[PDB]
Amino acid sequence: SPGIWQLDCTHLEGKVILVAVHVASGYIEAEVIPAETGQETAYFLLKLAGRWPVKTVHTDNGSNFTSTTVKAACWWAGIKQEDGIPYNPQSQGVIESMNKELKKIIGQVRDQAEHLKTAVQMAVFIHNHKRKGYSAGERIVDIIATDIQ
Amino acid sequence: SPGIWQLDCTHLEGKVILVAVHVASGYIEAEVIPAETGQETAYFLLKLAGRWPVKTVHTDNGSNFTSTTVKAACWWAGIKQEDGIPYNPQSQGVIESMNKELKKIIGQVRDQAEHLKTAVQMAVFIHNHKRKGYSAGERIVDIIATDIQ
Ligand SMILES: O=C1Nc2ccccc2/C1=C\c1cccc(C(=O)O)c1
Numbered sequence: 001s002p003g004i005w006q007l008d009c010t011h012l013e014g015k016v017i018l019v020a021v022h023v024a025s026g027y028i029e030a031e032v033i034p035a036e037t038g039q040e041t042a043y044f045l046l047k048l049a050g051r052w053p054v055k056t057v058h059t060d061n062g063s064n065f066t067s068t069t070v071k072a073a074c075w076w077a078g079i080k081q082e083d084g085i086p087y088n089p090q091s092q093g094v095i096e097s098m099n100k101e102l103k104k105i106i107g108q109v110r111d112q113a114e115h116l117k118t119a120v121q122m123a124v125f126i127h128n129h130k131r132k133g134y135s136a137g138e139r140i141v142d143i144i145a146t147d148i149q
Numbered sequence: 150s151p152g153i154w155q156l157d158c159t160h161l162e163g164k165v166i167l168v169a170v171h172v173a174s175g176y177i178e179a180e181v182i183p184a185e186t187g188q189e190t191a192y193f194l195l196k197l198a199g200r201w202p203v204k205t206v207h208t209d210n211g212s213n214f215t216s217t218t219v220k221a222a223c224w225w226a227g228i229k230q231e232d233g234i235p236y237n238p239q240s241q242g243v244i245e246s247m248n249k250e251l252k253k254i255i256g257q258v259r260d261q262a263e264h265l266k267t268a269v270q271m272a273v274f275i276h277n278h279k280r281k282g283y284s285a286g287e288r289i290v291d292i293i294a295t296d297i298q
């Protein structure tokens with residue numbers, strides 16, 4: 001579980017926000033893209049796996065699961081690509097809740113940024129630093145550090 | 150020193166590669182931009198600080214040190230912005246060496262990617278995973294985890 005991430009795609013202002021959630025910690029990375037393509041998803045995963053030790057990715061839908069470009073990026077980066085079917089039904093609900101929370105934060109910062117991408121990165125910052133006590137940022141580092149030792 | 154990062158700007162294929170190096174570990178994040186502007190640097194730092202606990206940034210040049218947009222992003226994200234003048238002359242040489250090493254890796258992967266940005270992220274991946282025995286990715290996590298406890 002230190003290496004397990006979940007992909008999540010949500011929509012705002014006619015654009016797409018692609019999110020990777022580290023399941024065990026709640027830590028996220030996100031980007032704005034014009035639309036969800038295999039190529040964009042592939043590039044996003046390459047960035048993620050260069051930054052964190054990504055072992056398994058639960059893909060967000062069947063198109064990205066099937067995508068040859070996504071499969072190539074997962075091969076390149078040593079990621080086991082899996083489906084994202086909630087065998088636990090409380091899982092989708094947690095993502096649903098996270099998308100709602102992220103959009104709430106985006107709303108709270110939206111006027112401080114001209115471009116949506118800036119607001120999204122402010123929201124990532126706030127999300128990862130929020131103490132719940134540890135923050136998601138603290139939890140992911142502790143989880144992975146423990147795993148290394 | 151767990152929170153200290155150094156900005157570095159290098160050039161390839163008529164484009165600019167902006168790099169943030171975590172000084173204590175050698176871990177890097179990087180992006181390709183058309184040219185180094187205050188706005189691009191500001192956005193890059195916002196992304197970085199949402200992902201890692203960035204306390205201090207040594208800026209790469211006087212224009213970014215002076216930039217009102219960079220100063221605003223540092224204020225927003227709780228980053229102490231400093232100059233990047235090598236009080237130790239072995240510092241610049243280490244960055245010089247890193248740029249050369251990064252460009253070497255980019256060369257080694259360049260044909261596997263159409264776009265430079267893909268090659269750069271492959272290079273970030275290889276750099277951060279290389280065992281030298283721990284990798285830069287392992288070192289940054291251990292450093293920050295120790296600091297939290
Ligand atoms: O001055 C600034 N405060 C910031 C605090 C955080 C991040 C950026 C800024 C920033 C300017 C900036 C730079 C790029 C894009 C955008 C945008 O409006 O999308 C604004």
Ligand SMILES: O=C1Nc2ccccc2/C1=C\c1cccc(C(=O)O)c1
Pocket residue numbers: 038039040042043046068069072073074076261262263264265267268
């Ligand atoms: O099939 C693929 N293998 C990969 C291994 C790693 C990353 C991407 C790919 C990938 C395709 C892809 C996707 C986006 C851009 C580019 C580009 O050429 O810049 C290529």
